[PDB]
Amino acid sequence: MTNKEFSDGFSTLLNSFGITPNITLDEYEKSTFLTNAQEQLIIDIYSGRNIIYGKSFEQTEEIRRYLSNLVETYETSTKVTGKLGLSKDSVFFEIPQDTWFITYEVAFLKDSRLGCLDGIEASVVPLPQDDLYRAKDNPFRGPSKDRVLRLDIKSDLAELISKYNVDKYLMRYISQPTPIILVDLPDGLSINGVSTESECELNPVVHRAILERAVQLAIISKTQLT
Amino acid sequence: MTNKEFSDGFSTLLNSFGITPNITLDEYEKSTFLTNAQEQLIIDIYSGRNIIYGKSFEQTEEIRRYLSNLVETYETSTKVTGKLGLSKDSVFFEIPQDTWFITYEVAFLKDSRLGCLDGIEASVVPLPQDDLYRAKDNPFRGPSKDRVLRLDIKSDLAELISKYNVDKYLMRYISQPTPIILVDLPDGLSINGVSTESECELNPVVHRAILERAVQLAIISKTQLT
Amino acid sequence: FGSGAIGYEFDNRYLNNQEMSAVAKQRLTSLP
Amino acid sequence: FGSGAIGYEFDNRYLNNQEMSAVAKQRLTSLP
Amino acid sequence: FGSGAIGYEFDNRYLNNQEMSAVAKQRLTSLP
Amino acid sequence: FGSGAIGYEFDNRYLNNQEMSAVAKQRLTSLP
Amino acid sequence: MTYNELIYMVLDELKLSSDDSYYTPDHVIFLLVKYRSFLLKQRYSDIKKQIPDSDYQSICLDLIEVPAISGEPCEGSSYLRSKNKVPTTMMIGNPRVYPMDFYQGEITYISRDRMRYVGYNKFLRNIIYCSKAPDGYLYFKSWNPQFLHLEKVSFNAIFEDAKEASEMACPEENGTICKLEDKEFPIEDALVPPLIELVVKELRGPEYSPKDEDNNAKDDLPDAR
Amino acid sequence: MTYNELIYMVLDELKLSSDDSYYTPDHVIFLLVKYRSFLLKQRYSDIKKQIPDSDYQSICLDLIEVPAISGEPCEGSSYLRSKNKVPTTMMIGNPRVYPMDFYQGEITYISRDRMRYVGYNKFLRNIIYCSKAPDGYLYFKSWNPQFLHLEKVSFNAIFEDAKEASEMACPEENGTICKLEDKEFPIEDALVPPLIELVVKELRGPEYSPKDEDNNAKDDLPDAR
Amino acid sequence: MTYNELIYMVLDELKLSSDDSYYTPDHVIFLLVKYRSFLLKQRYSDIKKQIPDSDYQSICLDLIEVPAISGEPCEGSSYLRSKNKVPTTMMIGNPRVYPMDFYQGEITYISRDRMRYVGYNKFLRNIIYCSKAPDGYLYFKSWNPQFLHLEKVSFNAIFEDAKEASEMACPEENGTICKLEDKEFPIEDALVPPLIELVVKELRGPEYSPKDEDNNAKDDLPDAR
Lengths: 226, 226, 32, 32, 32, 32, 225, 225, 225
Hints:
The structure is cut from a larger assembly and holds 2 copies of chain A, 4 copies of chain C and 3 copies of chain G. By secondary structure, chain A is of the alpha+beta class. Chain A contains 5 helices and 7 strands, in the order H-H-H-E-E-E-E-H-E-E-E-H. In chain A, helix 1 packs across helix 5 (about 205-220) and helix 2 packs across helix 5 (about 205-220). The longest helix of chain A is centred in the N-terminal third of the chain and has 21 residues, at about 25-45. In chain A, about 35% of the residues are buried. Chain C has 1 helix and no strands. The radius of gyration of chain C is 16 Å and the shape is rod-shaped. Chain C is about 55% helix and about 0% strand. Chain C has one helix at about 5-25. Chain G is α+β, with helices and mostly antiparallel strands. A 7-stranded mixed sheet of chain G has the order 3-7-1-2-6-5-4. In chain G, helix 1 crosses helix 2, helix 1 crosses helix 5 (about 190-205) and helix 2 packs across helix 5. Chain G is elongated, with a radius of gyration of 22 Å. The chains are: A alpha+beta, C mainly alpha, G alpha+beta. Chains in contact: A-B, A-G, A-H, B-G, B-H, B-I, C-D, C-G, D-E, E-F, G-H, H-I. Chains G and H meet through helix 1 and helix 5 of G and helix 2 and helix 4 of H. Chains A, B: One of its GO terms (cellular component) is virion component. Chains A, B: It is found in: Virion. Chains A, B: Forms the tail multi-ring barrel with ring protein 1, ring protein 2 and ring protein 4. Chains A, B: This is Ring protein 3.
């Protein structure tokens, strides 16, 4: 559906300007509720907390086709220099700043101590801070040629603790969706920092689910004190 | 049922212009609710979440006869060149952009290394990103001559990870159904980007179920605040 | 759950021991 | 729960004992 | 709960007694 | 509840009895 | 019977029909090939019994002359050896290397240890001997310099890996069978129902076990996810 | 009794009547033949007993003269082999090759290993021999050159596959029977209730097992779908 | 007792009275005929015991002279054989071919293997011998050319298939009994209660099992439909 179609279908579903009691919303509130429904729906779908689907990020073809247009892949070889880490062999990499959730994450190693296993594609294992001290010396769960431990820290950084030097950092995440803004907003207003019109980037299948969730959100908004 | 029959049955079931209290809809509202009922019904049928049916995409003859007319087959040999993947031997193929859910997905291989087995049809296995690292080296679930890993990425793409070169990519998916538009809509209006009349392409068996669901959606729309 | 890669061999070994016990009592007599 | 590194050895040892008992009865007779 | 520091040794002793019983029937015969 | 100061001794004594029964069958043969 | 029939019997007993199944036919091939050797050892190792003809396979080897160690003069006499590595035989059947005719010729397949010391008997100085070296190749040895001209032999034995020896299978009259699934599985029918039962028991429990299904940077098996 | 009666008895006991059933009659055929071989070996391998004529089965073979290795002057004497591959026999009965009259002729069927060293005895020089070679064909050898003229023989034995020997069965007086389902199943009626019980037990549990029904790019077996 | 009484005893024990029953009387006949041979083997194979007269049946055969192989001169002497294929006897009773009078004549029913070599004894050159060839016919052999004039014999044995030998039953004084249900079942009463128990146990479980009952292009047995 297009922005015109979002607006028209949304008005039809709310029975705006009908003879029965109804709700009429501005295009700004339509944008607000559509965006809120979009983000709530896709977070619930990623976490698997939506009862109607009850399915996780890539657990069926339905969810694949819903959130296929948010997954972006990122590479980086620049290491942030001045930071304090929990290990001498700890390197820091900057996050693309539009990430929500990291789903795949990999590091490539370039060390002369790796023999003929140079450039070994090592899995990045996110580890809690309880496990770190006892995982540093773990030979089965600690850093190795086939394992890298990643810890999240402030300023959107990723502390990669590795036994060997890390040259590159490959990662695949769910990206910020473009908000659903049905009209170029006046000066001052914006949704997620966007002021002009902005079409939903997901597949058309989930647009109607977003529409009904937005309608329910609007009804709750106007009928939470009555 | 035809568009005229759709509208007339919709009016008859809604008791339009009868002596009792009732609901009267415009042909645009009838089209909107018929399309919403259609797409809700087929998605619930495909996912097997309809309590009335309780059957999946092709789990019985009834559901076959319902969604037979959305099943579309697709072939492609072109590969998208500039993309960043999760492996060196990763090729990217475009999706037809009208797909809803991929149901059959197979890949023919052309490589010299698999000698005398050349042109082997290979089963595309949709694999989540959790399993990718531990499936790349898997000789039973990883890429091989009889198995290819497909990962969904942005911009309606399919990242095929194979050990051998992939020449052709075959699909059989569920398509976007044509909307149920009962009248040539005025300028500006559209349903799914279609402005002219659009007849339901499914079988007449499910047209009356679609009509019942559309009627229920209409009453819900008019009777959600009273 | 299910797996018989250890029970099958133990049963086979038990029956092999029974086999050897049975055939160890076989005698071709003398003094007729 | 489950771990069969001590059950396996004890069953194998039991079967070894029974095998030794079986073969210890074997004789090659005389006086024909 | 769980602990096998007393059951393991008793099982081992049982199998040792079976071992000694099995090997105590071994005879190298005479009179051929 | 639990206390194994009498179960342990009785199991050990049972194994001692069975060991004495085993070793009491041992003989060093003659007449070669 | 062929690999295809056994594989799909196992799959249909397990009902692993969907392409979106965790346990693919490759797991089935692996389990079948291992349980075959397991059953054959369990049946034909306790005491010597007749082995049927179904348990055997014929591989065909191409021999090449190689130095004993290197090209030195004093490094001993040269040996022939198969071009490619040879499968390991089980010790239960009737291994035999024959010169493309099973009913003729005398090439003796012996142990690695024995072949160190063979042919010193004056009447056994013309007998070709065979063994699989730790290199993984079949090495040939004899005191009769005519043996070095040998170019092709076929080896019939109950090979320990059906997949390896079937890949090395000898060319048929029609031609080579490319796909392993269309080749013939090496086992007697009286051992097939037990083999299917063992493999199906092996994968029945794992078939219905939970998965770490949520992509949340977390281990989800303790929660039976 | 024919294959049809046994197959449909198993199916009707399983009540696999709907054409939309997972387990087709071919599963039944495969299981029946493999359990036939299993039961025959279980009954007639432990000790020697009488095998009834019902477990025996016959095939027709056409013999062609072939070289031992290839066409060469010094590669040895030629052999006679069946045109088509021969089913493996079970070492439990009385395998016999006869010249289309069971009560006449002496064509011995011996082990493949024995057949190398045979015919040296002066009085055994006119006896025709057989053995299923690793190639799969039934080779013939003798010292009396007249054997090469032999053109057509029959072979009676308890074959490993009932289906393979049924396909190679001798023509009847009426003619050939096109359908395998219309041929006589080679098992004694005293062994049929055990066979049906074993096969029905094989397929009872699987008959009610869950399937991966949903088409959702997911394994649905852990959820009992 | 007749086939009808046994069949309807089984049916009434199972209460398969409605015409709309899955298991028809044909299943009952099949199971009865197989379990009869099963019980007879189980009782009269371990050690030799007296077999009653109820276990036997007399078939009557019409003999025709046939060549040994074909019409050649040197293809051996001709044999007589029954016009139709003969049932297979079990090896537990007292098989006997008699010339329409049980108390007279000497026609010996022997094994297939033995009949290859019979009559070389000068005093046994006038004895007619019988055996069931792998063809399925009863072949006759002797050294006394008078045997070829024989036209009719009756064969009394414990036949392995009651249905086959009852179909070949000899004409009674009143006339032929067309329906098998009106013929007499071949079993002693002391084996009838066990036979009914075994058949009823065989079909009791299947009687109450679910069916794939919905016509929906789906297998409905996993859901216990």
